[PDB]
Amino acid sequence: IGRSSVRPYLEECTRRFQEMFDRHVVTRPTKVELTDAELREVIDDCNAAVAPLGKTVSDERWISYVGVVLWSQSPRHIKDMEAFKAVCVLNCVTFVWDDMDPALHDFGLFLPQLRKICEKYYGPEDAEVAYEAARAFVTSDHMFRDSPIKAALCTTSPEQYFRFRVTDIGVDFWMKMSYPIYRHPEFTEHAKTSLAARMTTRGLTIVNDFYSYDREVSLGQITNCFRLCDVSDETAFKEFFQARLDDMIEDIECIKAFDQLTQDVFLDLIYGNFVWTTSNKRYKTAVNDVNSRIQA
Amino acid sequence: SSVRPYLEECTRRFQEMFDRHVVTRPTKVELTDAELREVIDDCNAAVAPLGKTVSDERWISYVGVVLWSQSPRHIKDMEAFKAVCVLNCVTFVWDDMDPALHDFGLFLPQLRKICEKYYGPEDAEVAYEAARAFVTSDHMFRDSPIKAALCTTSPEQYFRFRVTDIGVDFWMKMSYPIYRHPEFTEHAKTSLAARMTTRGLTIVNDFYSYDREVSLGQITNCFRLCDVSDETAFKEFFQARLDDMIEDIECIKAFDQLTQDVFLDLIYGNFVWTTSNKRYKTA
Ligand SMILES: [Mg+2]
Ligand SMILES: [Mg+2]
Numbered sequence A: 001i002g003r004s005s006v007r008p009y010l011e012e013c014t015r016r017f018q019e020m021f022d023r024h025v026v027t028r029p030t031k032v033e034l035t036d037a038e039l040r041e042v043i044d045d046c047n048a049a050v051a052p053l054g055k056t057v058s059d060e061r062w063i064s065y066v067g068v069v070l071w072s073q074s075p076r077h078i079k080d081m082e083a084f085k086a087v088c089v090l091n092c093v094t095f096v097w098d099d100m101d102p103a104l105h106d107f108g109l110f111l112p113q114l115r116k117i118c119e120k121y122y123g124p125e126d127a128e129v130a131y132e133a134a135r136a137f138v139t140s141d142h143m144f145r146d147s148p149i150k151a152a153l154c155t156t157s158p159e160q161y162f163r164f165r166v167t168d169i170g171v172d173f174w175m176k177m178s179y180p181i182y183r184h185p186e187f188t189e190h191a192k193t194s195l196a197a198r199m200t201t202r203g204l205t206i207v208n209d210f211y212s213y214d215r216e217v218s219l220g221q222i223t224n225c226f227r228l229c230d231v232s233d234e235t236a237f238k239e240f241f242q243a244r245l246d247d248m249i250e251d252i253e254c255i256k257a258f259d260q261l262t263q264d265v266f267l268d269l270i271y272g273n274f275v276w277t278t279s280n281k282r283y284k285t286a287v288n289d290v291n292s293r294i295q296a
Numbered sequence B: 001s002s003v004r005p006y007l008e009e010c011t012r013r014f015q016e017m018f019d020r021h022v023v024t025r026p027t028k029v030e031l032t033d034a035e036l037r038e039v040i041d042d043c044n045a046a047v048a049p050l051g052k053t054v055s056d057e058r059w060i061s062y063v064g065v066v067l068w069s070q071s072p073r074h075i076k077d078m079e080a081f082k083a084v085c086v087l088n089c090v091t092f093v094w095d096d097m098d099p100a101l102h103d104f105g106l107f108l109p110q111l112r113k114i115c116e117k118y119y120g121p122e123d124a125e126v127a128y129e130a131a132r133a134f135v136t137s138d139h140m141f142r143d144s145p146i147k148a149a150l151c152t153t154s155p156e157q158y159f160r161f162r163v164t165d166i167g168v169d170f171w172m173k174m175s176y177p178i179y180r181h182p183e184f185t186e187h188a189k190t191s192l193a194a195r196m197t198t199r200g201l202t203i204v205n206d207f208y209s210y211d212r213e214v215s216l217g218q219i220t221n222c223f224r225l226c227d228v229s230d231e232t233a234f235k236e237f238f239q240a241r242l243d244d245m246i247e248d249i250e251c252i253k254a255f256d257q258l259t260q261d262v263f264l265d266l267i268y269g270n271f272v273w274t275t276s277n278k279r280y281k282t283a
């Protein structure tokens, strides 16, 4: 398995995902429109942050990354657009880190840039929280690139895999830098306990694992739950896919027990990510110029 | 209902499991009589503004879990160790207190005082934030619809809640200064450490504290997800929880040797304390 694929299922599963969201979430996500200059403010900061790492990346590639933030926040409830712009920058620059050959990982060079982004957009205390989460994320991505721990958690069972993904997919980082956008106390506390990350991990990870399976197997990347099944076996795939859909539904139904603003945010993240993932260049083909490995 | 009809068998089954999968037994940390008094003085000073007194016996009951569940082979900082002793004991008191007794204005400063006494500046912020998050979570979720949904839906929703609520995430973020081991610090700060150890800690505590919490109408206990009266269903459910512990423990063994030691000493350590301590023999 290195040239295995979920291509045959692409159509049916997208419809299965879509019908699950129509039944259980209902409310469609709405894309944040960035003005002319906000978009270039963001992209300018993004280049500045990765510039020390010595790899050019395109405005096309930036706008691929930033799409998840434009689509998966909660525009009904946004209050702080400076915090929003920060999440755009931080998520974009850590995507680059994610897509990057570990030889290009310079902490001494990159970590000061993360701190600068945070101090620019947040107040003193939010900046510290956003930075520790940024630091932990890029440190975790680097730590596990060939770790035996990653192999154990990703090959043992769904539970061990999703436990790894709370940090690795970046959703704990996302909550801890997104709470200042909303200035909602309940959500802020769920972000700080990581309950918010834990509630949304499977919904984000299952969707992303399906649509990025082809790219990741081609690159030898083993962090994908559908590697726990034989995708060439249609019966095994469909049974596994079904249990992953049950996981998403159970999570969503428990999310509805949270207060109204908080659950709106959780569901806009799960559903928004699905709209971005299924409409974006990054998940259209295994290898292209917005998702190719950034190497030596 | 009660799980006393099962206590004898399940204790042996727990032990058999640890003997096979962990083997290395926990050992109790001995404090000098000076150290014990410093801890108890710090504990009494932190709870005093809340207006409740705590017997010296009940403090030593609480501190048992820290004496037994650290990894004495790897300790490099006894000031950090006494911090955990103090922080664990005082947050125990907060756990057992009626929500009306909860006052953040008075208690949060005492937590920060403790962390500032025993830790460097960076560690003190990490320990204090985790202490704040724990007591704020325990308060927030008393009679919360969220807690009811997460504890009555499935084991998976339940254990997700317990990562924070049982206090293991707090434990790791206040305990990594004890060891100054760079890998363990990172797993502690990602909360991977807490996630790896949540079920081993929670399943044990849930079994032995089931009787108390059912009497007090507390729902945060996984054995309320099965019918403890039906002994077939109980044995089935208890086996699945045992399988949960075994899988976690085998995956923990892929962590580095020192980190793996701390994780397993934590889970096994808590089982010995729980089974022997005053806290868990009557409601
Ligand atoms: Mg990744
Ligand atoms: Mg990736």
Ligand SMILES: [Mg+2]
Residues within 6 Å of the ligand: A208, A209, A212, A216
């Ligand atoms: Mg992926």
Ligand SMILES: [Mg+2]
Residues within 6 Å of the ligand: B095, B096
């Ligand atoms: Mg309790």
Ligand SMILES: [Mg+2]
Residues within 6 Å of the ligand: B095, B138, B165, B166
């Ligand atoms: Mg409790």
Ligand SMILES: [Mg+2]
Residues within 6 Å of the ligand: B205, B206, B209, B213
């Ligand atoms: Mg208990």
